[PDB]
Amino acid sequence: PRTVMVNLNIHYYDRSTSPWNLHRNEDPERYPSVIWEAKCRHLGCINADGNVDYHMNSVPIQQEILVLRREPPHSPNSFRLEKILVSVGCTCVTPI
Amino acid sequence: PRTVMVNLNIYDRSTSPWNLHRNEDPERYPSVIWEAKCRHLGCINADGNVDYHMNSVPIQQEILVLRREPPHSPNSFRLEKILVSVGCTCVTP
C-alpha cells in the first residue's frame, strides 16, 4: 500500500434553463461527513417564454470526486481515498 | 495542528457544451486536473446554431487538494482549497 501523512488544518445559477436544488447525505464514516448534491429542479428545460418544455432534458452533471473512508472502520486517524460520483449542477440536453 | 495517515490506493448534446483544459502542478496531488471551459459564449438553438440571447456559464466549485509540505516531498501533504471549473450550464441574462 501507499501511506502518506496528511495535515488536516486548511490553507447566481437561478437564471439557468436547467436550474437545481441541493440535497444532503451524511456518512460519519467519511470526510467530508456531509455532502450536498444537485437535484434538477424540472424534467424539461425553461423557455424564453418561461415555461417548461419537455422536448428538452434537464440532466445532472455527474463528477468523479475523491473522499476519505476510515480504514479501519471507526478510526480517528487513518483512511483510504475512495472515488464517488456527485451532482455538481444540471445542464440542458437535446434528447435521443 | 493534527496529522492523519492516508492510503492513496483507490453529455455532448448540451445547449451549453464544454471542453477539457488540462492543469498540471508538480507540487500537487493529484497533479493532473481536468477543468471545464465552455465552448461558446451563447447557447445552441433548436436549429443547431449559436445565438447570444442566452449565455453559457461555467459551474465553479471549491475542492480540497494535497499540497506537498515540505515542498518536493514524496510522502507528506497538507490540504489546500482551490476553485475548479467542473461543467457548463445555459443561463438567462
Ligand SMILES: C[C@H]1NC(=O)[C@H](Cc2ccc(NC(=O)[C@@H](NC(=O)Cc3ccccc3)C3CCCCC3)cc2)NC(=O)CC2(CCCC2)CC(=O)N[C@H](C(=O)O)CCCCNC1=O
Ligand atoms: C455545497 C456544499 N458543499 C459540499 O457538500 C461539497 C462536497 C465536496 C465533497 C468532497 C469534495 N472532494 C474534494 O475536495 C476532494 N478532491 C478531489 O476529488 C480532487 C479532484 C478534483 C477534480 C477532479 C478529480 C479529483 C478532496 C481530496 C482529498 C481528500 C479531501 C477531499 C469536494 C466537495 N464541499 C464541501 O463540503 C466543502 C469542502 C470540500 C471542498 C473544500 C471544502 C469541505 C469543507 O470544509 N466544508 C465546510 C465545513 O465542513 O464547514 C463547509 C460546509 C457547509 C457547506 N456545504 C455546502 O453547501
